Design a protein around this ligand. Structure first.
Ligand SMILES: NC(=O)Nc1ccccc1
Ligand SMILES: NC(=O)Nc1ccccc1
Ligand SMILES: [Ca+2]
Ligand SMILES: [Ca+2]
Ligand SMILES: [Ca+2]
Ligand SMILES: [Ca+2]
Lengths: 146, 87, 87, 146
């Protein structure tokens, strides 16, 4: 719960991601728009709870100082290795710790935002450590999070 | 930089739901215990009644707990987004 | 009888959310790795971009997981209620 | 996933808790009413998911055989000691493992459905093992779940 100077400035930039009309205040409406752009669907009550948690003076909106104060409370991060492994596991059809290079290309070129076949080339080159056309995704994720 | 790391995890409306549901867990835990262990003669209609009330209260507290986990991750989404500006 | 015990725990809409979000976790994990470890010259605007997409995908999967836990406990509420008739 | 005869009959009784109009079929509307009577608030999509999970033939409602089949899958129970302890902990203001007899009476006669002062008498008589006017609620819950 103590922030540096550069971080205070960087978080002013961050405030503009939320303060969509730039009026110096973040409202439930602006948080709804932002959360939906991130593919989530908070209810009105959830938006209100998210404002209220950091709404120090109770005027119904979050100011930069309320926003900054709050970030100081939550600076701690943790590694994402297991969550990332679990995302790969979604595509492990046989539950055997492997996804084939062919199946990985198929996933990456069809689902989500997608990679180009050239970008997939590079990914598989790194992922297929043994050159056996199979991705041990636990090992690949360990490599990327090291 | 932060690379692939993310914010580490772990209201008045919810607070009222918690106190009422928790009080009811205490209530029905006691009444089930009484009616199954401190009586000469178990009345099964009584036990069934308090079992229904017990499961409703336990599942109400679960619901609040799940909503708090949800709220916490919604807040952490926003904090994570803010932290992209640290890059 | 069952006394204070309860059912032990642990869709197509959710299934599509999972496959798309998971594919995007793979996508942005890769692109962040590439842009922070396999380049001569780190482009921070690129890293920031993929960090935003990475956190959105990770938090989408969390959201699905939380909803499945919620659904599971809703079903278990109904099974618990049904089990009161075993008393 | 194998049910006795008495249980099949008991679960026919159970089906009527859900089949509110007795028409032999449980609908999303009936599950909404029931879930709300239990103090929960499932969305339409959640109600539909709960029907669909056990809707073997896809006609949109659950029959007794779909309902029965399903119960067979979920007969396993587990003890509730820790959850019950956590409910008591809600009232442990100082986080010290104790709730006074006075505070317990206050809670039980004011919050939730409530107990009569006479019922609270009996509860405290059992709960206050040491006769010190204090309830070690971990110990009390262990006694009741033994
Ligand atoms: N609770 C919480 O974190 N709220 C929030 C976060 C970022 C911006 C605005 C509001
Ligand atoms: N998923 C699930 O358990 N659904 C359900 C439970 C009881 C009655 C009717 C439907
Ligand atoms: Ca604004
Ligand atoms: Ca405020
Ligand atoms: Ca009906
Ligand atoms: Ca059906």
């Amino acid at each position: 719960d103590q922030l540096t100077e550069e971080q205070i400035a960087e978080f002013k930039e961050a405030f503009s991601l939320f303060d969509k009309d730039g009026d110096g205040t973040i409202t439930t409406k602006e948080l709804g728009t932002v959360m939906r752009s991130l593919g989530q669907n908070p209810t009105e009550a959830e938006l209100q709870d998210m404002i209220n948690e950091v709404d120090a003076d109770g005027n119904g909106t979050i100011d930069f100082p309320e926003f900054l104060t709050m970030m100081a409370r939550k600076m701690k991060d943790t590694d994402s290795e297991e969550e990332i492994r679990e995302a790969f596991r979604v595509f492990d059809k046989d539950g055997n710790g492997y996804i084939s290079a062919a199946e990985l290309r198929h996933v990456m070129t069809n689902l989500g935002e997608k990679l180009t076949d050239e970008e997939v080339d590079e990914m598989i080159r790194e992922a297929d450590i043994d050159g056996d056309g199979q991705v041990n995704y636990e090992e690949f994720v360990q490599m990327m999070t090291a | 930089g932060r690379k692939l790391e993310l914010t580490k995890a772990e209201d008045t409306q919810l607070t009222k739901r918690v106190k009422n549901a928790a009080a009811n867990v205490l209530r029905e835990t006691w009444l089930i215990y009484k009616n199954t262990k401190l009586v000469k003669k178990i009345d099964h209609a009584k036990v069934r009644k308090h079992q229904r009330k017990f499961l409703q209260a336990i599942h109400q507290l679960r619901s609040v707990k799940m909503e708090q986990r949800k709220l916490n991750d919604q807040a952490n989404t926003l904090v994570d987004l803010a932290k992209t500006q640290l890059e």
